[PDB]
């Protein structure tokens, strides 16, 4: 009965497989599909720019994380939850976190570990909602995300 988690997972997972496989996801949207569709469109704009801007830095971070299986994804979750609980919250950090998740998801596809992509999207979501829930509901959730970036 967690709508915020459900909607957030739907958005973040679709973005991660899209970036990994290079093909859009035509699977029909869920309950608030209008907002989710536009948030996914927003992510394509701001998430691709973040990944391009920080390609060398994202690669250096991924190389130090050494992600090859699901247990390495778990060690990433530890890092994500620590920095997303440091008391600093803004939309730019949320975009950056999902953008790096898409970067990692591209790497998992390259090393034939596509089965680790869904666990990755779930862990980013769990970190997002657990640490930023009260802020997110104040910003009107993914409606605020869409309005903030256009």
């Amino acid at each position: 009965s967690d709508e915020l988690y459900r909607q957030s997972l739907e958005i973040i997972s679709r973005y991660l497989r899209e970036q990994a496989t290079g093909a859009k996801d035509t699977k029909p949207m869920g309950r608030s599909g209008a907002t989710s569709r536009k948030a996914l469109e927003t992510l394509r704009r701001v998430g691709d720019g973040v990944q391009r801007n920080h390609e060398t830095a994202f690669q250096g971070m991924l190389r130090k994380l050494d992600i090859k299986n699901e247990d390495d994804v778990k060690s990433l979750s530890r890092v994500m939850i620590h920095v997303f609980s440091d008391g600093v919250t803004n939309w730019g950090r949320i975009v950056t976190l999902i953008s790096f998740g898409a970067f990692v998801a591209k790497h998992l596809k390259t090393i034939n570990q596509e089965s680790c992509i869904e666990p990755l999207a779930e862990s980013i979501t769990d970190v997002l909602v657990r640490t930023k829930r009260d802020w997110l509901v104040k910003q009107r959730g993914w409606d605020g995300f869409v309005e903030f970036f256009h």
């Binding site: 830095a57 971070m61 950056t96």
Partner: peptide, 16 residues
């Protein structure tokens, strides 16, 4: 880079 140092520090990459 400064804009993502908070994330890269946690990972251990020093020159962000």
């Amino acid at each position: 880079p400064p804009e993502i140092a908070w994330l890269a520090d946690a990972v251990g990459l020093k020159d962000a």
